[PDB]
Amino acid sequence: KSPAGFAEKYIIESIWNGRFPPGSILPAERELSELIGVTRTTLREVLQRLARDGWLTIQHGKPTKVNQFMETSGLHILDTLMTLDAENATSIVEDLLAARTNISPIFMRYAFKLNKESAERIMINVIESCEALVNAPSWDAFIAASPYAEKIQQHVKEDSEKDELKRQEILIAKTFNFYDYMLFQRLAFHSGNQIYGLIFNGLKKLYDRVGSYYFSNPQARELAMEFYRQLLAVCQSGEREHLPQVIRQYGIASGHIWNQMKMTLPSNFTED
Amino acid sequence: KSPAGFAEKYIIESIWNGRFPPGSILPAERELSELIGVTRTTLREVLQRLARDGWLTIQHGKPTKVNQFMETSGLHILDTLMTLDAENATSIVEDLLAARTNISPIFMRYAFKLNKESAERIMINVIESCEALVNAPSWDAFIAASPYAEKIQQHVKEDSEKDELKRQEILIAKTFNFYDYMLFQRLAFHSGNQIYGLIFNGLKKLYDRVGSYYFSNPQARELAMEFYRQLLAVCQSGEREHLPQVIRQYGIASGHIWNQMKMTLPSNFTED
DNA sequence: CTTAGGCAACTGGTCAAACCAGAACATAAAA
DNA sequence: TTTTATGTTCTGGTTTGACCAGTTGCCTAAG
């Protein structure tokens, strides 16, 4: 393990399980330095990071106070909570799915009127790039499929000669998730209101973690593409009356798919 | 000024104006230590903070790369953005008001269904605590008016002495804004969906920044209170039928109030 | 020639021991 | 009694310079 990383995981977990409870005071830096096993400097960088995340309140002369997170932290903790409160990973995702289903008719609305075929262009881009499905397993010769530092996978949970067919399935899940997130976020910025885009930016780690498993099911990918083409039809037609109906039918359908995939969660699902 | 602070504002401002442009590479840590005037360690703490905010991408061996913010950062940058290009601080606020007017019918509906009782009680708490108006201006001998650390103003102003009654005006603005934020955020958490609460937690600095001036107007404060009571009437009544009417009449009304008050902006407005 | 070693010259990360500065509280002297 | 100093010692902030560790690429030595 690495010093700073272990320090951060130690402090965060100690706050979660109740060793550094919210509302108390984090012990002096000099003491955590010998309590954890890291030098003071490194521990201070960790502390600055965590405080910037909203776990702590720091100001010199006064003792470091352990914040009441969920009241100080932002949309980012939802990912961390998944690996801290795995028992309730069930609920978190369905919040993520609910929120997106609730606010999507809001920003897509405006997006379809203000920047109509910036919307249509990125949507078409997504749909046609989502032909990783009607192709043989290495489609990474199209696209100008160079900028994919986001989809990278070192699978080495292995024993046999199937690390090259499992890996490509996970790669497919990851790519479809890549384009899904691209769709929702880029459409969320073209609403003329930044906040809807910043929301997706905040939830991105959770979004990708959920998508990389949800899109390991072809049954979901085909509904996703159908959803995309329906949205495209809406934006092109220009009548937005049908938009909410589209979004909540997709919501309930993908909802049932998730209810099926909820039972058998990978056990690399809730981790860092 | 203090080292870490000047290093951070220097870096963020340099990224903003184009000296460390998005897409470029941040100079080596050893080079900025001598370009800025801070020791390397401190500069590293600053870098860790900024990277956690999403301004940079760090990994050792490779050069620190300056992220394309607005694609990496979250809801927090809107506040900094207010103080980086004040010229369009005009637009930013109108986003903060728009989003809130859009998503308020979303969570307030669910909050009025799941936790009707906690909703109305925290609302009642807010409304009755908002009797700082019908009282002589230093009213924090009520409430158990002790937990008041957000609630601080030694701005020092002055030429001499009517400078205990504008303080009290700004303090009235600050406390009313405090309760406004309490209402929206706490109602956003009692919806059963954490994300709506995390959104407000993320925007808290911008919300406080705008509110501390918007609520220096008594006419804005009582429209706010009548709004609170209308919402209370909705939650108590149990039919959510034009909760949305209530919310957007308040939206447009507060809209016009904001539209006259934008003209004369205090100009400690866009600063940290 | 080409190619597979391995050597530097980058980069960020960790480490050490002092010291600087704000905040607090006990306590002494003044009110 | 209460209250204004006042200073020791709590806390976090900054300094220094040295070393440790991945990354990349140049440049040998082997194919």
UniProtKB/Swiss-Prot annotation, chains A, B:
Kindly list the biological process annotations in GO that this record carries: fatty acid metabolic process; negative regulation of phospholipid biosynthetic process; regulation of fatty acid metabolic process
The subcellular localization recorded is: Cytoplasm
Cystine residue pairs: none
Q: Write down what this protein is called.
A: Fatty acid metabolism regulator protein
Q: What are the record keywords, sorted?
A: Activator, Cytoplasm, DNA-binding, Fatty acid metabolism, Lipid metabolism, Repressor, Transcription, Transcription regulation
In Pfam terms, one family for this protein is FadR_C
Q: How does it assemble?
A: Homodimer.
Give the species this sequence originates from: Vibrio cholerae serotype O1 (strain ATCC 39315 / El Tor Inaba N16961)
Q: Which gene encodes it?
A: fadR
Query: CDD domains in the record, alphabetically?
Result: WHTH_GntR
